[PDB]
Design a protein around this ligand. Structure first.
Ligand SMILES: [Zn+2]
Ligand SMILES: [Zn+2]
Length: 229
């Protein structure tokens, strides 16, 4: 269920996987949730995405200290927007090595964000070039093409049924694709399908702005993206 820790929410999705949720007030939408992941890999912890702010991200780290009590080996952030990279300074202050798509690190300063310390690059097939993602353990990082943003990336967890679409993917009942100011309207639809095809057996699709959903989240997202082209 939803464990409350301060102003954040943590939900266990699998024996070694939790979803972190943090909130930010946005005009016309109230308090908007953003979700990322925490993965225990043996004797270390891996984080996918920051919370919206440094203070919230520090609380993620305090939750990890309380519930898992193992070092956070690295954090991977899924593109250059506040909900995914707003807490980078908090990770660095804690001594945690950070990774992002090279394109995200290029965009970060212009977006008013702090870049990750290491850049991931991607083969033509979308899969991360493995030498650029050392010690990622069970995290399988995939660039599906431009969609929600030019730099958006996605993450599957080996040995689980979970794939994380970040902000590329909306739930099966979502009424819109959300924030499209930096979207690639020509390629969004194909990128959504590419994510589904890269993680074909994942039955739990985790995403930034809805609770985990079935693979129908992918088909439904791709359909609305079809209307932008
Ligand atoms: Zn975004
Ligand atoms: Zn988002």
């Amino acid at each position: 269920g939803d464990q409350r820790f301060g102003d954040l929410v943590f939900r266990q999705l699998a024996p070694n996987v939790w979803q972190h949720t943090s909130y930010l007030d946005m005009p016309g939408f109230g308090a908007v949730a953003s979700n990322g992941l925490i993965v225990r890999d043996g004797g270390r912890v891996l984080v996918v995405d920051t919370a919206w702010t440094d203070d919230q991200t520090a609380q993620i780290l305090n939750w990890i200290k309380q519930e898992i009590n193992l070092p956070v080996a690295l954090a991977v952030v899924t593109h250059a927007h506040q909900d995914k990279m707003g807490g980078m300074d908090a990770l660095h202050a804690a001594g945690i090595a950070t990774y992002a798509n090279a394109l995200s690190n290029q965009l970060a300063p212009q977006e008013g964000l702090v870049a990750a310390q290491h850049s991931l690059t991607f083969a033509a097939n979308g899969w991360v070039e493995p030498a650029t993602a050392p010690n990622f353990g069970p995290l399988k990082v995939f660039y599906p093409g431009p969609g929600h943003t030019s730099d958006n990336i996605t993450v599957g967890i080996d040995g689980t049924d979970i794939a994380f679409g970040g902000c590329l993917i909306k739930d099966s009942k979502a009424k819109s694709l959300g924030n499209l100011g930096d979207a690639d309207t020509e390629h969004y639809a194909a990128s959504a399908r590419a994510f589904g095809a890269a993680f074909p057996k994942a039955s739990m699709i985790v995403m930034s702005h809805s609770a985990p959903d079935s693979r129908a989240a992918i088909t439904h997202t791709a359909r609305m993206a079809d209307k932008l082209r």
